[PDB]
Design a protein around this ligand. Structure first.
Ligand SMILES: CCC(=O)NCc1nnc2n1CCCC2
Ligand SMILES: [Zn+2]
Ligand SMILES: [Zn+2]
Length: 581
């Protein structure tokens, strides 16, 4: 307790000595409260005018328009798992780190790699003070002396400045220094692709939205039961102290400085936390707790993937009868569990697609559906179903939800097969109409519209309305202006290369599921969903509003071109049959 967190609390207390007071009307029950102090401040979603002016029919669709308008799960407790459950988790975690470590070497990430990340806008979840932005702190030796002070404090097993700032979500921003030390010790999990499909068998890290459907269809080819895709209620809030201890076992594979720097991240920042939260009653509360997930988002993704892979192997073990009860594992069940892992563990990992808290599992048979005792006792309670009601599985891989999508099998006029990503079109148009942050020039807004358009041309070309709207936006933005994002899966649409050339590289040349590498010569060779299927997935094809928009699209394009000014533009609309004379 206070021996590990006191120094951080001590230090904050003294910076606000004028305002320190143990408030008695504090709303916390499961967080340890320490004190309050005086502050006064808060970032709403802004509309992208370029995308909205080129999507006029959606101006009267509430599911689109409402998306641009506008903490009692975080303050709850998880119970300690039973002895049998704790044993299953420890054995599985030990085995899984070894498998992930067979073809990989843990190593520290560098000031250089960090500096390079900050000098190309990656969402590192830092705060604004002594320097303005991340870019300036990184180009100043004073910062690195603060980093050095904390670094030597961590080697000594102590912490002074690694404090979270809070803001079914919750983001835990830290100062750039604490983010660096996290990246130095644990960045290797992401930087060296520990959760690639080649390395982890269940994982999809780095795979890309154009691969995920082919991956689900490959899982579907295994003999076994339904495909299960159960969502956890508030995954980050159900991470137990036993989970954080199994995750820390990655340090058993390290040596030297690295092993000590990693052990300190887990001990001092993950298994003990100090957090500052804004309460309108506007004060700042300094609260602490031992469990739950609260790391950088990239480390969070890898450890969520690890603990989810572990949890789902155990649910598979329960379905297969490898153990009888979570109350207690007998000596001979331990050897049975170890022996299952060695004998079939790698086959069972290949039956899964796991993206952090998101999973799809094709178990050996449907006993999995009612195998709930370990899952519930680990705290991974399913969303939108009663605790002991059996899971409903999916009979067709094309119906399974994964990473906010479903996937269609689409047959090209020439016989070849595309497996394409899809989701309700209102969600796609509603997201592309939104920007985050202040000070957007018209050029920067246009280049963000262009990024959405090129993503649509690469991933959603099969949706009639999105191929047309993508062509219109790319026609309305100057041809040489470079697509941008402020927050940055593989992003092959982020390029000034011709989108037909990129489509050929992604869907034909580099597609390991496409045997015939004959390039496509025009967009007209690239198919759409059935018209009825496109309507089912939210198309406006068939509406009078949509017909007028498609017919008059050159008028909309010219409206945006007149706003941007006398720049060099390309007409991409004749790449479509209906605008081709
Ligand atoms: C009508 C929309 C367009 O193509 N761009 C607007 C625009 N702004 N100055 C000029 N133009 C076009 C060419 C003449 C000079
Ligand atoms: Zn620290
Ligand atoms: Zn669809």
């Amino acid at each position: 307790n206070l021996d590990i967190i006191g120094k951080r609390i001590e230090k904050i207390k003294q910076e606000h000595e004028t305002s320190w007071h143990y408030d008695q009307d504090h709303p916390y029950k499961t967080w340890a409260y320490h004190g309050s102090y005086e502050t006064k401040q808060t970032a709403s979603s802004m509309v992208n005018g370029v995308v909205r002016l080129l999507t006029k029919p959606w101006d009267i669709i509430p599911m689109v328009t409402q998306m641009a308008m506008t903490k009692e799960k975080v303050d709850t407790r998880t119970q300690e798992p039973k002895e049998g459950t704790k044993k299953l988790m420890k054995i599985t975690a030990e085995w899984l780190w070894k498998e992930l470590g067979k073809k990989k070497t843990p190593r520290m990430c560098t000031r250089e790699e960090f500096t390079r990340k900050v000098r190309s806008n990656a969402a590192l979840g830092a705060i604004f003070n002594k320097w303005k932005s991340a870019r300036e702190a990184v180009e100043d030796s004073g910062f690195w002396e603060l980093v050095d002070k904390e670094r030597n404090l961590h080697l000594e097993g102590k912490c002074e400045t690694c404090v979270y700032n809070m803001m079914s979500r919750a983001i835990w921003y830290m100062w750039l220094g604490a983010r660096f030390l996290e990246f130095e010790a644990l960045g290797f999990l992401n930087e060296d692709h520990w959760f690639s499909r080649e390395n982890s068998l269940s994982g999809v890290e780095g795979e890309g939205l154009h691969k995920l459907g082919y991956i689900l269809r490959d899982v579907s080819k295994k003999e076994g039961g339904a495909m299960y895709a159960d969502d956890t209620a508030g995954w980050d809030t159900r991470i137990t102290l036993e989970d954080l201890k199994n995750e820390e076992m990655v340090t058993n594979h390290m040596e030297g400085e690295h092993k000590k720097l990693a052990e300190a991240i887990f001990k001092l920042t993950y298994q003990n936390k100090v957090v500052r939260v804004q309460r309108p009653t506007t004060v700042m509360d300094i609260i602490s707790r031992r469990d739950q997930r609260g790391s950088g988002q990239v480390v969070t993704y890898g450890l969520n993937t690890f603990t989810n892979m572990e949890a789902q192997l155990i649910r598979q073990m329960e379905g297969e009868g490898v153990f009888k009860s979570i109350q207690h594992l007998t000596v001979t069940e331990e050897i049975a569990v170890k022996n299952w892992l060695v004998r079939v563990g790698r086959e069972r990992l290949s039956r899964m697609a796991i993206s952090g808290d998101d999973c799809v599992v094709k178990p050996l048979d449907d006993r999995f559906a009612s195998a709930l005792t370990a899952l519930n006792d680990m705290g991974k309670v399913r969303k939108d179903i009663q605790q002991w009601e059996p899971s409903r599985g999916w009979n067709d891989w094309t119906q399974v939800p994964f990473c906010s999508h479903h996937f269609h099998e689409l047959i090209m006029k020439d016989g070849r097969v595309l497996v394409v990503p899809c989701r309700n079109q209102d969600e796609l148009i509603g997201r592309a109409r939104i920007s985050q942050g202040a000070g957007w020039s018209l050029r920067e807004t246009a280049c963000l519209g262009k990024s959405y358009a090129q993503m649509w041309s690469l991933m959603y070309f099969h949706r009639r309305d999105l191929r047309l709207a993508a062509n219109a936006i790319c026609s309305a933005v100057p041809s040489h202006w470079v697509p941008t994002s402020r927050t940055t899966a593989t992003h092959e649409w982020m390029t000034t290369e011709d989108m037909l050339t990129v489509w050929n590289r992604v869907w034909i040349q580099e597609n390991p599921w496409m045997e015939d590498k004959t390039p496509v010569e025009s967009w007209e060779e690239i198919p759409y969903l059935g018209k009825r299927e496109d309507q089912w997935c939210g198309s406006l094809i068939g509406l009078t509003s949509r017909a007028t928009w498609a017919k008059n699209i050159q008028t909309a394009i010219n409206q945006v071109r007149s706003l941007i000014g006398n720049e060099e533009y390309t007409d991409y609309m004749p790449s479509m049959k209906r605008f081709r004379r």
